[PDB]
Design a protein around this ligand. Structure first.
Ligand SMILES: [Ag+]
Lengths: 127, 465, 128
């Protein structure tokens, strides 16, 4: 019921969940009156939910906003749906700017395979 | 009759007798009896109900048992307390069915789920309550035996009666008592202490004689557990002196490892839990080896290297010995780094901190006339440079900057700290004279342009070496 | 030549170029007897090259290699070509990861709209 054996079962590391415990990401478990910490099965479910959220490519702020509305009987799934829609809109804006860099750059670097001549038309055009 | 402490330690070991298997399980059963005496005597304590209530509040937000048994089996003593509290406190304290309900509350206690941090709290609270009633009795003895001219024998016969209300105070002002007629000169502490005893009794909800014999049972059980622990650790000193052969290196003496294995065996006494059916030597071997490695990690080295790096450097020494046996040549750090699955710079870093520093009395010469210490360089060096120039440059600045006949020398001597205590910036020297920083900067640049020319500061120029 | 108008030319501040100086990808500039950084025309070309990639065309891990090969000064127009082919392989793995994430979100994030029916198990289905 400790944290590192549960991390090894779920496939996580102890440093990640300890960094989640350092900030306001995972709910703080009760102290087991020793140098260890016990876990509720709901805490393990929240841990593997946050691991599934971080492994697919969500930022940790929005996954923290997902796990704040986890393990509670309210569970509103409309405003957090709009927040995840804005998150993937920002992700698609990042995709758009990186593909803009991709089709901006890739038509200038054909020749000059590594000769000792000090003449290149890429850097003088870019700068 | 001797001079070696370890030989008379062996004599004290040979004074006591060892154990067989049946003797081992008999001393384990005596340890169990000494534990369970305190475990059943704490069931008669009223603070154990509040302790189990705060334990149930702690496990509310929670081989091992299911937590539903912890939720269910930690709430019946509260019901027994609330059906006993109308009889133990109300409608008189001296009652037979009240003591029957006390025994009924005590016989439902075996739902332990023992935690060593949990066991300390009840013992500490009952020990400070026993300490409070003991210093109450001690201050009463200080005001009644030493004062008012009556011995100790004229106190206990009135102390053992009730010790609840004001009858024992004027019981000591008995039929004549001409030496003890000072009533108000001694009342001022004793009724203030009796009100504290009364509020203690209403806190515990019981008379002082019952908690007195309860604490006497606590002391008896603790003394029996201490004697059982004593014979357990005395019957197994052969274990620590037989396990201390494999760690007899020249880092520590024998006795420090023996007395560290003693406290390891003392921890293994309470960590034994003999109901699994094992022997004490087999489980105590791990704890004593842990204590031996802890002592060889913390001690046996001048530079105290921690226990994890001690473990990695012991594994590195074992791997180096294995590669010596497999190759014959001296072990390079590359093979130890690839077998240690560690980077090579960490291997050389833990190799650098190899051993205890050469002591000061080793004969590095040919005879015993000059030991070490006559070859060490000084860290706080005082060279001809560091002794001469550190004052002659100060005298040179005191001669040259005295020719500066305005406030530029006065703001430059505190700009760097010459003939001053605290070094100041431009802001701190500004508030004294010139609060705008750039005025002090411009006068510093003017003094620099005056001093950088090789015309009169050539004696200051020659000090660059 | 103190770098303030140079910082307005290159489009950055003193902190980012100071962090670039503290890293092992920028040549050490000249100090004009006061601790201030001096940047010449070749240094201005290096600064505009690193700012024309980090804010515009690349990240730090590739613009550092670009400004390292720029001070050779024998430049290569095909080493940067295989470098940006590896970079577009890395970012196409990145965008296929993000499009798989978007497809998984649209597959296991559809729920009921805003009404009086709370307690949706879609977060529990995303937990697994
Ligand atoms: Ag070229």
């Amino acid at each position: 019921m400790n944290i590192s054996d549960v991390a090894k079962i779920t496939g996580l590391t102890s440093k990640a969940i300890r960094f989640y415990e350092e900030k306001g990401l995972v709910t703080p478990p009760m102290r087991s009156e020793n140098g260890y910490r016990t876990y509720t099965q709901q805490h393990l479910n929240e841990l593997t939910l946050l691991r599934q959220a971080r492994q697919v490519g969500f930022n940790l702020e929005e996954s923290g906003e997902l796990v704040n509305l986890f393990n509670d009987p309210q569970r509103h799934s409309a405003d957090v749906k709009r927040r995840t829609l804005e998150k993937v809109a920002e992700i698609e804006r990042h995709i758009e700017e990186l593909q803009s860099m991709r089709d901006q750059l890739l038509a200038l670097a054909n020749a000059c395979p590594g000769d000792d001549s000090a003449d290149c038309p890429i850097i003088e055009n870019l700068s | 009759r001797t001079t070696d402490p370890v030989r008379m330690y062996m004599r004290e070991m040979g004074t006591v007798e060892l154990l067989t298997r049946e003797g081992e399980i008999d001393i384990a059963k005596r340890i169990e009896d000494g534990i369970n005496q305190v475990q059943c005597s704490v069931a008669e304590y009223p603070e154990a109900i509040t302790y189990l209530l705060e334990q149930y509040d702690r496990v509310e937000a929670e081989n091992s048992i299911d937590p539903e048994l912890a939720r269910e089996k930690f709430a019946e003593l509260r019901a027994q307390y609330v059906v006993t509290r109308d009889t133990i406190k109300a409608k008189g304290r001296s009652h037979a069915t009240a003591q029957e309900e006390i025994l009924k509350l005590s016989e439902v206690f075996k739902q332990f789920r023992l935690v060593p941090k949990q066991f300390d709290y009840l013992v500490n609270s009952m020990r400070v309550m026993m300490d409070r009633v003991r210093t109450q009795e001690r201050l009463i003895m200080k005001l009644c035996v030493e004062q008012c001219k009556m011995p100790k024998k004229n106190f206990i016969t009135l102390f053992t009666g009730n010790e609840t209300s004001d009858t024992w105070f004027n019981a000591a002002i008995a039929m004549n008592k001409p030496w003890s007629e000072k009533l108000h000169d001694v009342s001022e502490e004793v009724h203030r202490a009796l009100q504290k005893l009364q509020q203690i009794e209403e806190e515990t909800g019981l008379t002082i004689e019952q908690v007195k014999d309860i604490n006497r049972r606590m002391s008896i059980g603790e003394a029996k557990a201490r004697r059982a622990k004593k014979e357990m650790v005395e019957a197994n000193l052969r274990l620590v002196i037989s396990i201390a052969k494999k760690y007899t290196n020249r880092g520590l003496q024998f006795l420090d490892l023996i007395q560290e294995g003693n406290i390891g065996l003392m921890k293994a006494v309470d960590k034994f839990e003999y109901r699994r059916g094992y022997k004490f030597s087999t489980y105590a071997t791990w704890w004593i080896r842990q204590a031996i490695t802890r002592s060889i990690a913390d001690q046996a080295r001048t530079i105290r290297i921690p226990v994890h790096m001690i473990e990695t450097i012991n594994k590195l020494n074992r791997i180096s010995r294995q590669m010596l046996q497999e190759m014959g040549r001296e072990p390079t750090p590359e093979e130890l780094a690839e077998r240690m699955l560690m980077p090579e710079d960490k291997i050389r870093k833990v190799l650098k901190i190899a051993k205890e520093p050469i002591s000061m009395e080793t004969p590095i010469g040919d005879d015993e006339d000059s030991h070490l210490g006559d070859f060490i360089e000084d860290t706080t060096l005082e060279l001809p440079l560091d002794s001469a120039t550190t004052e002659s440059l100060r005298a040179a600045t005191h001669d040259v900057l005295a020719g500066l006949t305005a406030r530029e020398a006065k703001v430059l001597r505190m700009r760097f700290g010459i003939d001053m205590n605290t070094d100041y910036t431009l802001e701190e020297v500004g508030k004294q004279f010139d609060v705008t920083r750039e005025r002090i900067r411009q006068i510093e640049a003017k003094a620099l342009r005056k001093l950088r020319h090789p015309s009169r500061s050539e004696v200051l120029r020659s000090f660059l070496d």
